[PDB]
Amino acid sequence: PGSMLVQTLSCLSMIITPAFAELKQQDENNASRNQAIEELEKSIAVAEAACPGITDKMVKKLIEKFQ
Amino acid sequence: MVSMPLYAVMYPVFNELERVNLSAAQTLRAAFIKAEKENPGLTQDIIMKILEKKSVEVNFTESLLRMAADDVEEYMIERPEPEFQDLNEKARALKQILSKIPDEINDRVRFLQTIKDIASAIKELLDTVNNVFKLEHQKKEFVKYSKSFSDTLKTYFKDGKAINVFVSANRLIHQTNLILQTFK
Predict the structure, then answer these.
(1) Distance between CA B29 and CA A56 in Å, rounded?
(2) Between vectors from CA B115 to CA B114 and to CA B118, what angle results, nearest 5°?
């Protein structure tokens, strides 16, 4: 359907993946930190699969706290 | 306990996500808890990086301080004894006053009043803890971070760097929450 467009527009692909990549780049040799980051992204993906759009809402509310 | 950025920033977001889907929300919460558990300071990095990627320009610790006065339910005391009700009131007051710092620090008169208010609130909170006692490790930690806040003020009036005051205020709020949780 609109599969590719939906996931392309989701904050998972738009925000989370690059952000986490950079977070790893902050300390590229720290194994446990990078593994924590990877597991976290995996779990966010699980949550997104369980409820499409929830990452968008997480991000939006997040920034709505900081305005 | 979890880290302050987690419970103060992310936890309320997780709660609001529950009406969307409870399972997925619980997944998010548990995941963040585990990630922060494994590598402390990570939640802050995540939040700041996300704020960066959305071009939200505001100081993280200042905003943290601004939003840090609300109750954390899972840590809060709901007991019928006078000592604990007093504990909750005093702790609440301290957290609120400390949260008002970013709004008052750019006006020296107001800020000079805020310092007196904070001293008063800390005195009363300590009174209340003493009333509960009739443990001491948490009291000592609280005293240490109060003193640290005082010293931070001393440094601030010299170098004028408010960010340090924001940091100390946040840590004192976290210690207040720790008092709450330990007495719970």
Answers:
(1) 15
(2) 85
CATH of range B1-184; options 1.10.12.10, 1.20.120.1950, 3.40.50.720, 3.40.630.30: 1.20.120.1950
Counted across chains A and B, CB pairs separated by less than 8 A come out at 101
Contacts 24+ apart (CB under 8 A), A24-28: A26/B45
**Resolution in A for the shown PDB structure?**
2.4
Q: Name the architecture of domain A1-67.
A: Orthogonal Bundle (1.10)
* Ranges of each domain in chain A: 1-67
Residues B143 and B60: their CA atoms lie apart, in Å, by 26
Closest-CA distance of chain A to residue B36, Å? 8
Chain B neighbours among A 8-47 (CB < 8 Å)?
A: 15-16, 18-20, 22-23, 26, 30, 32-33, 35-37, 39-40, 43-44, 46-47
Instruction: Looking at the complex, report in whole angstroms how far the Cα of residue A8 sits from the nearest Cα belonging to chain B.
Output: 16
